[PDB]
Every structure is written in structure tokens, then in C-alpha cells.
From a paper:
Protein-engineering methods have been exploited to produce a surrogate system for the extracellular neurotransmitter-binding site of a heteromeric human ligand-gated ion channel, the glycine receptor. Acetylcholine-binding protein is a highly conserved ortholog of the pLGIC extracellular ligand-binding domain (ECD) with properties similar to nAChR. Mutations affecting key residues in the orthosteric agonist site at the α1(−)/β(+) interface affect the potency of both activation by glycine and inhibition by strychnine. We therefore set out to generate a high-fidelity surrogate of this α1(−)/β(+) orthosteric binding site using the 2α1:3β stoich­iometry [Fig. 1(a)] by exploiting protein-engineering methods and the thermal stability of acetylcholine-binding protein from [name] (AcAChBP). Ultimately, the highly stable AcAChBP framework has allowed us to introduce nine amino-acid substitutions that have resulted in a stable surrogate for a heteromeric neurotransmitter site that binds glycine.
A previously published structure of the WT AcAChBP–strychnine complex shows a single molecule occupying four of the five orthosteric sites in the asymmetric unit and one site with two ligands bound. We note also that this alkaloid displays a propensity to dimerize or aggregate at high concentrations. Our structure of the WT AcAChBP–strychnine complex displays a single well ordered strychnine in all five binding sites per asymmetric unit and we confine our comparison to this binding pose. The orientation and the position of the alkaloid in both WT AcAChBP structures is very similar. There is a single direct hydrogen bond between the alkaloid and the protein donated by the protonated tertiary amine to the carbonyl of Trp164. The potential hydrogen-bond acceptors on strychnine, ether and amide O atoms, are placed to interact with solvent and in so doing then form bridges to the protein. Strychnine is a promiscuous ligand that is active against different receptors. Electrophysiological assays indicate that the alkaloid, although the prototypical competitive antagonist of GlyR, also displays the same activity against some nAChR subtypes, with IC50 values that range from 350 nM to around 40 µM. The affinity of strychnine interacting with AcAChBP is consistent with the activity that this ligand displays against the orthologous binding sites presented by nAChRs.
Author numbering:
A (entry chain C), C (entry chain A): 20 to 225
B (entry chain B), D (entry chain E), E (entry chain D): 20 to 224
Write the structure that this text describes.
């Protein structure tokens, strides 16, 4: 209690919040998806709804401490409002993303942060052929809304979407689900933009 | 008024809020459900909606006081924003949980806290067989979102879900409802996670 | 303007907010309902939606003042956030209550407060038989969420729900509407809890 | 920039917000509606949905300044949170009113304020006869929620609702739309209440 | 980190926020739309839903800095709450606009700001004829809610709406989409108001 209180006071009250990365001091953010459910499909609007956990990890020098100086504390939990978080956004959502979990992050003594919001997302997807044996493929890109590849580098720990928590009695079964880093250039602008392309192949079950 | 004002000032203004548990100083949180209604079932999306009260109890040394020092006050009510509260979350919700009651907790002189949010929850459930006599069983786990079993231990006072306030004219009748502590390990994570599994067997009326 | 500004400053900035009642210093809260409309019925979910005004009144010594000391002001209006308000809640709602009026209360020099939120409420009600001549009866209890009868006493000024503002062209006509104080005990806990039971008998029009 | 910053600092940081009117110092608020669209009708619930702009004007001595003292500034725009605003409310809404415009007001050197929220409103209305040539008439009163006629006087600049921005391809055409000051007493209350009654006659194509 | 922290502290903590433009010091805001999808059409209410990115650009002297003084930083990203933003609003929305992107802007050393909110908008549109080969045309104006043309000038970089990100498998195909500056006068008021008129011609695929 007392040690943790002192640590949080030192990290958060005695210094300003991290202002985000720059060209000079870029930040790597790792993303991974855990797909829980394809909740619904809307063939009249071509919108599909997913529920997933989006794991985000990054590391800041300003969040480092020595466990010996603070009662051997190697990590703690704190409100996501206490710290900077990356602006990772679905590019083709049709509704505001709905948050299903509390906004709390885990901070480790090496300055690494793990933040894993559960979300429900409606996104642009033609579900025609979902009732067939081949099923249907849909895709949605996630990236920083305003940081280029010079400020934020996105990576994945794996190209496989974690399906170990997928709901066994969903209306839809997953045939494949991948998460792939893409570099993108746009005609206006010189700098590269990074996204992770979440590609899901699915169909109605049996 | 004056005594209570002084107590709240001492507990909340004159010291920092409890920062949450650690490996060294873990916290036990007791959970209990009162199921009020199965409001609806959606066979096109496999989502079911429940209304329930979720009682949460825990105890902190930092919330202790001597009643004699504060006008014989043995307990008080306060906004949940004034205190730390646990991050207990349904694992398989499909919509943000909707809160139906005001966010107020009861604090007792021994440092124990009782907080009982009424909630409406949409969660993943295949309702196939709800129209049958056998009915259907659905389950949803509740636990801390980011604290492991090393920091937060969950328990129940009983394995029976309180059904005494269940809505008599619901579209669905309850055949059974249980609440059971589970210890879980994951491929992701080395540390154990504790949840309470709410299992409800029901059918159409 | 100047006198009222000074009064509000004295009551709200120069002292802490009332911390709520206790066993030693209980508070009586008077409730009355004005039923405006039965807006809808849902026979697939057994939910009914009402629109009403819920008048709440109570009195605090801490909100007293002498009109002579403050430019002859006998009352004022203020945001409900400036003052303590009771945690009166429907026991059997199925959705969060929707507030239709601004959150403003009237405070009188004797310390009495009048707060009258207009609300739309979805609550548990089987509407089977609403299309019949006998109609249907539904009920919903309102009480403090966490204060017992030792801290908050609820009363009504009358057992009749005010129907003078009921919408003349509603889909549903009201046969009766009553509001009755009840004392209740629950198996766990020694202390009594007070509620007001709103009972409404209605049917389809004409 | 610099002059305006100084003016806002003098008006808002150097003095308290206006606390609202009293019996001794009543306030006149002028209302006017611009009806944009009758968006929908629900004959199963007797709810109708309108989109309109509600112009509100009032004048306070505390918001006066001399333009010469502040770089010739005769008016400025500011967040509605910086100032007091009246609690004008539809009496027969069935859903919380939805705000479609940013909450910003215009303040003029004579202390006059203009605030014009665009809103979508669902209100109690039987639409039976909307498909006929005569159409249907519906009405909704707007007034202060908690100030009586002793504290706030409402007026209109005109009895005609502005229809110049009405959506030409709406599902519903407007036959007439009026806005009329009414004085009212209630069984509850000794003091008179002022409202503006918005009466709209409309029909399908 | 350290240089950027100092820059933000200098710009945002050590001086007041920009209070908005005046007649004396007007501001030009450039708008451009990127239409992503016509998501739905409602022929029972004459409402259509679009998803788009609205790029907004303006320039303030108060946001200028010398890169040499701050570690060669030529630009940074910051929360839109840290800075003033224009009150650009759709004139004919039927629901509050839904924001799909985080509220973050890019600020450049010359004081220029780029802010690009992704939005879902329901607006007044008769979709009769959408199933035909000619299709249907709908329009919606965007402008400042309370600043006139004397305080805020709107312009476009181009009259063509960017369709390069339009969703290939939308139910609706775009025949044309234009964005055009308009000057407007209103009977009440002496001052001109500027808007950008977004005109979209589309049909079923
Ligand atoms: C924090 O942890 C370190 C070890 O992980 C502790 O340091 C050791 O304490 C043991 C047991 O008393 C000694 O025998 C070792 O010599 C110490 N050093 C090392 C490097 O192992 C330390 O005492 C812990 N601190 C607290 C307050 O619990
Ligand atoms: C409060 O009320 C008293 C009277 O009840 C006001 O004082 C009187 O003011 C009138 C003019 O309005 C004078 O002619 C009287 O001589 C005053 N009498 C006394 C005893 O003071 C007083 O002005 C009121 N306060 C206000 C309006 O702020
Ligand atoms: O030109 C583009 C299109 C592209 O759209 C998909 C979403 C993206 C997320 N943000 C939103 C704005 C954007 C951007 C920034 C700077 C120049 C061009 C540009 N955009 C989008 C772009 C990506 C990346 C970035
Ligand atoms: O990927 C998972 C699966 C599992 O999901 C059920 C809920 C859990 C409670 N919290 C939420 C995040 C989670 C966790 C932490 C770190 C990596 C992966 C991960 N999760 C969930 C997990 C448990 C434990 C933990
Ligand atoms: O045990 C209960 C059930 C009962 O539910 C109906 C509604 C009530 C209003 N509040 C909500 C919490 C509650 C309460 C307080 C303390 C211990 C148990 C307890 N609850 C509910 C109770 C009443 C009274 C009170
Ligand atoms: O009983 C009523 C009905 C009537 O409703 C129309 C609107 C009004 C404006 N405010 C809102 C609350 C109200 C009022 C005050 C005290 C007791 C009952 C009561 N109401 C409304 C009333 C008027 C006047 C007042
Ligand atoms: O008289 C009007 C109608 C017109 O409506 C289209 C939208 C507009 C954008 N803002 C919103 C308020 C408004 C305006 C300013 C001052 C008095 C009246 C008034 N309005 C609207 C007007 C334009 C311009 C401006
Ligand atoms: C900034 O640019 C100058 C000029 O090239 C260079 O000398 C300096 O090292 C750069 N970096 C910093 C942090 O000032």
C-alpha cells in the first residue's frame, strides 16, 4: 500500500505525462487480437459486428523504476487515464467502438505497459456467402489515427489471431483469422503509415 | 452531520486513495448474484440479456475507524468514486454493461465495504432448446480484468444464486442458477486467474 | 444577483456538502408521482415504458438562511450537483432510467428542497390482457438503494398518483394508479427498508 | 486575441457566474423555433420526432462592457458552460432531447446573449389522420422546468414558426406551425407558469 | 520526450488557449471530405447515413515555434482538447453525429493544425429513385454554428470529394460527389454565413 502509493506519486504527480513519440524518439507498439465472437451480420447494410480483446504493448523510460527502491514491487495496475495510450483505431468502423472492459493497464518496472481493452466493433463487410460452405472473408485495418511510421511502428507478436477464447456456440464458425502488418503510402504525403490488417474468414455453423 | 463530515474528511482528504492490491498484500473480494429477470433471448445472434444485482464485499485497513472517536458512527454511505472498487467484469459480454442503480457503497468501521450495482448484461449464449421442457443452460464468468489470483482472490458466500427477487411473470422460468469459484490458467499468462462462473438453466414459460 | 450570488457562495463554497443521513439524524423524503404516459408495451420481453415526474422533497438545517440577511430572498434554483440528493431508485427497471428534464432543484429559506426529475422508465411488466376490458395491472417499487429505514424514511402526501397531466391521446387509458408506502425486510439483514409501490392498472384505449 | 482574452478574463474569472433570476429581479427570455423536419411518426406509441433550432435570447447587466475599453469588440462567441443558460424544456418529451449543434453562445456588449441549440425531440402526439388531406395537429409546450412566471417571463418575437428552412423532401408537409405564449396554473402550485406552445399541423404526401 | 514536453508546456500551460476569431482577426478554415460509405437509407423517414473523414485545417500564430529552440521538432500530435477547434456542424443532421476516431490533431511549427475526425452522420435525404439507373442526389451543408463569414472563412482545396477510400462492396455506388463553398444570407441577420455544400449522387449497386 505505502510503497505502491509512493511509486505512483513519484511516477504520476512528480512529473508530466509522456507527450507521445516523435521522429527523433519513435515508439514501437505491439498489437494482438483475441477474437471472442462474430456476434452478428447485417446483409441489408453490409456491417458485421465482432467482439475481441485488443492487446497493446509499449515501453517508456519515464515509467521505469528499481523494485529495491519501492518494496520489491515489480508491477502495478493503474487507470489508463493516468498514462499516455496509443491512438489505434479501426479504419472502416461504421459505429463508435464500444468498450466492454474497465480502462486499466498493467505497468512493469522495466517501463513496459500492457493494455487490453475488450471491444465490440461494427465494420464494413459484405456477408454474402456466409451461409455457404466456402463462407465469407472480411477485413479491417487497425492503425494510428495521426502518427506515421516515423513516430509509431506497429508490430504483431504473431500473424495468427488468437482463437483460443472463441465462443464455441457462436452462430458463426471461424475458418481462418490473421493479423498482418502493412506499410502504406498515400499520394499526398511522403511518410509511411503502418496498419495491422485483421482478415477473418467465417461461415454459419453446420 | 458534523461527526460524519469529520470522518469522511479524515478517510478521504487526509490520505491517498487505496492504490489496489499486490502480491505482498492481496485482497479477497466476495461476490454474490441476485437474478431478477432474463429479459430477452436472441437466437439470431446468440445473445441473452439478464438483469441482476451483483453484491461485492471486501475489507481495507485504510477504511477502519473507532466509532467512539466519531460520535458512535459504525457505518456510512458514500459515492463509489470516493473509494477504490474492484474491476470485476463479465468475460463474455457483447455490449457494455448498463448500470441500473446509483454508484454508492456502504462502508463499516471494521473497514469492510459493500457495493451492490444493479446491472443489465448482454452475453454470449446459444438459446437453442429454450422452448423445450429440459430448457437451456448458459454460463458467464465474472472476474478481475487485470488482477491475477496473486492480487485478488474471489470467493462466494454460497453456490446458490439468490432467486427470491426473480420476476414471477418473466418470459423465462429458472430451473437452476449457481455461482461457483473457478481457478483458471491460460496459454497467454503464467499466473492463475480467479473467476466466479454464473450458470443459469432456464426455459420459456 | 449579488445577494443570491453571496447566498450560494455561503451555502456551497464556504462549507462541505451534506454527507447524507445517519441513524442519529434520519431524513424524511416525500415522494409523489405524476404519470404522464404509458408510452409502450413489449409483450415479447414483458417490459413496459412509463413517462412520469417524480417529485422528491426533504429538508436540511444546513440549507437554512434568514431572508433579511440576503436581500429578502426566500428561495432559489440550483443545479442538483450543488446539493446532496437522495438515491431513490426503481427496483425492477430493465434499462437505465432516462432523464427528460434538466437536473435543477428549488431550495427554500427553511432548508426545504424540491426536486422533480421527469423520467422515462422501462420496467418488468407482463402486459397480457391489456387489450381486454378488465385491462392489466403492473407494479414497480421505488426506494433508496443503500439507506435503510433507520436513515431515510419515505412517505407520500397521498396514495393517489396524480393523473391530471396524463396524456389524453395515449394508446393506453388508466383505470387506477396508486402510490403506497411499504416496509420491507430482507433475510440477510436486520434493518427495515422503505419503498413506495407504484401500482398502475391500464388498458388499450376505445 | 489579446483584447478578447482580457474581456473574457474580466467577465468570467474575475466574478461569479450569474446565479439565475428571482422574484425581485426577474428575467425575460425570448424563444423562437425554426422547424427543419418532421422526421418520423409512430402510430403504435403515439410519438412524433421533430428536428428544430430553438433560439433563446436574454440580457444580463453582468455581461455588459464598453467596446472602447476592449479594442472595439462589440461581441464574442463562448462555450455555453462559461455562462448561465435557461432551463427551457419540452413538457411532453418521451426521450431525452438530443443536441445536434455545438454548445456555443454569442454575447453582445449590451449584455445580451443569443443561444440557438439544434435539437431532435420525440414527444407525445397521436398521428391518426396524418395520411388524410386535413392532416393532423400536434402540440408541445416549452418552458422553464423550475422557474415560475415570477422569475422567468417567456415571450416570442412572433407567433409564426420559421418554416423557411423546412426540408422540402420531408415525408411530411407542414400546413401550419405556430408558437404561442401561454400562462398556466396547476393544482400543485400557487404560482403561474409560462410556456410557449408549439402547435404543428402536418400531413403525409 | 523532454523537448516535446517542454514545447507542449510552453504552448499550452504558459499561455491561455486561443479564444476564437473576431472581425479584426478572422480565421480561414479549409475543409475536405473523404467519403467512405453510404451505410444506409431509410425511405420511411427520409434519412440517409454516411461515413466519412472530415479534414479540417487552420493556422494560428499562437501555435508557432522555432524547431531549433525545441530539439528540431517540426510537428507533434496532441489531444484536440488541448487546442481551440472550429465549430463546423452539419446543418441538416437528424441525430447527433457519431465520432469514429480519437480526438487528436497534428500541429506543425508554422502554427498550422490538421484535424481529421471520422464521423457517422444521419441527415435529411429523400432516397426515392436510388434503385433507378439515374440514381438520387442528396445534399448537406457544413458550416460554423455561430461564427459568421466576418470571423471564419471556409474554403475547400478542391471541389471533388475524395472517393479513393470509398468502400468497394457498399450497397450504394457513387455517381458523383462534390464539395462547394457557398455564401448565404438569412433574413434575421445582416452578416453573411459561409458553408460547404456536400452533394452526393448515388444509386444501388
Ligand atoms: C527483495 O528481493 C530480494 C531478492 O529477490 C531480497 O534480497 C535478498 O534477501 C535475502 C533474504 O533475506 C538475502 O539472503 C539475499 O542476500 C538478498 N539479496 C539477493 C540479491 O538475493 C530483498 O531482501 C527483498 N526485499 C524485501 C524488503 O522484501
Ligand atoms: C427588503 O425589504 C425591505 C422592506 O420590506 C426593503 O427595505 C425598504 O426599501 C424601501 C424601498 O424599496 C424603502 O422605502 C424602505 O424604507 C425600506 N425599509 C427598510 C426597513 O429597510 C429592502 O430594500 C429590501 N431589500 C432588497 C430589495 O434588496
Ligand atoms: O489519405 C489518407 C487515407 C487513409 O485512410 C485510412 C485511415 C487512416 C488513418 N489516418 C487517418 C488520416 C490518415 C492520413 C494522415 C495523413 C495523410 C493522409 C491520411 N489519410 C488517412 C489514411 C490512414 C492514415 C491516417
Ligand atoms: O487472452 C486472454 C484470455 C483470458 O480471457 C478471459 C479473461 C481474463 C481476464 N484478464 C483479461 C485479459 C486476460 C489476459 C492477460 C494477458 C494476456 C492475455 C489475456 N487474456 C485474458 C484472459 C483472462 C486473464 C486476463
Ligand atoms: O438483499 C437485497 C435484495 C433487496 O432487493 C430489492 C431492492 C432493494 C433496494 N436496495 C438495493 C440493495 C438492497 C440491500 C441492501 C443491503 C443488503 C441487502 C440488500 N438487498 C437489496 C434489497 C432492497 C434494499 C436494498
Ligand atoms: O404537476 C406538475 C405538472 C406541470 O407540468 C408542466 C410543467 C411544469 C413546469 N414545472 C415542472 C414541475 C412542475 C411542478 C412543480 C411542483 C409540483 C408539480 C409540478 N408539475 C410541473 C407542472 C409545471 C410547473 C412545474
Ligand atoms: O436563421 C437561421 C437559420 C440558418 O439555418 C441554417 C444554419 C445556419 C448555421 N448557423 C446556426 C444558427 C444560424 C443563425 C445565426 C444567427 C441567427 C439566426 C441563425 N439561423 C442559422 C442559419 C445558419 C447560420 C447560423
Ligand atoms: C538539431 O539539428 C542541428 C542542426 O543540424 C544539430 O546540430 C543538432 O544535433 C540536432 N539535434 C538536437 C537534439 O538539437
Amino acid at each position: 500500500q505505502a510503497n505502491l502509493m509512493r511509486l505512483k506519486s513519484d511516477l504520476f504527480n512528480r512529473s508530466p505525462m509522456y507527450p507521445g513519440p516523435t521522429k527523433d524518439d519513435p515508439l514501437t507498439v505491439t498489437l494482438g487480437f483475441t477474437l471472442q465472437d462474430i456476434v452478428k451480420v447485417d446483409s441489408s447494410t453490409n456491417e458485421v459486428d465482432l467482439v475481441y480483446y485488443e492487446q497493446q504493448r509499449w515501453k517508456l523510460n519515464s515509467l521505469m523504476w528499481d523494485p529495491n527502491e519501492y518494496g520489491n514491487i515489480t508491477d502495478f495496475r493503474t487507470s489508463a487515464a493516468d498514462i499516455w495510450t496509443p491512438d489505434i483505431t479501426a479504419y472502416s468502423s461504421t459505429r463508435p467502438v464500444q468498450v466492454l472492459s474497465p480502462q486499466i493497464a498493467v505497468v512493469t518496472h522495466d517501463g513496459s505497459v500492457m493494455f487490453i481493452p475488450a471491444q465490440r466493433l461494427s465494420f464494413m463487410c459484405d456477408p454474402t456467402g456466409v451461409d455457404s460452405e466456402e463462407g465469407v472473408t472480411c477485413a479491417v485495418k487497425f492503425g494510428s489515427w495521426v502518427y506515421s511510421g516515423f513516430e509509431i511502428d506497429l508490430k504483431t507478436d504473431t500473424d495468427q489471431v488468437d482463437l483460443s477464447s472463441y465462443y464455441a456456440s457462436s452462430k458463426y464458425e471461424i475458418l481462418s483469422a490473421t493479423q498482418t502488418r502493412q506499410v502504406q503510402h498515400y499520394s499526398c504525403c511522403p511518410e509511411p503509415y503502418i496498419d495491422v490488417n485483421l482478415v477473418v474468414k467465417f461461415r454459419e455453423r453446420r
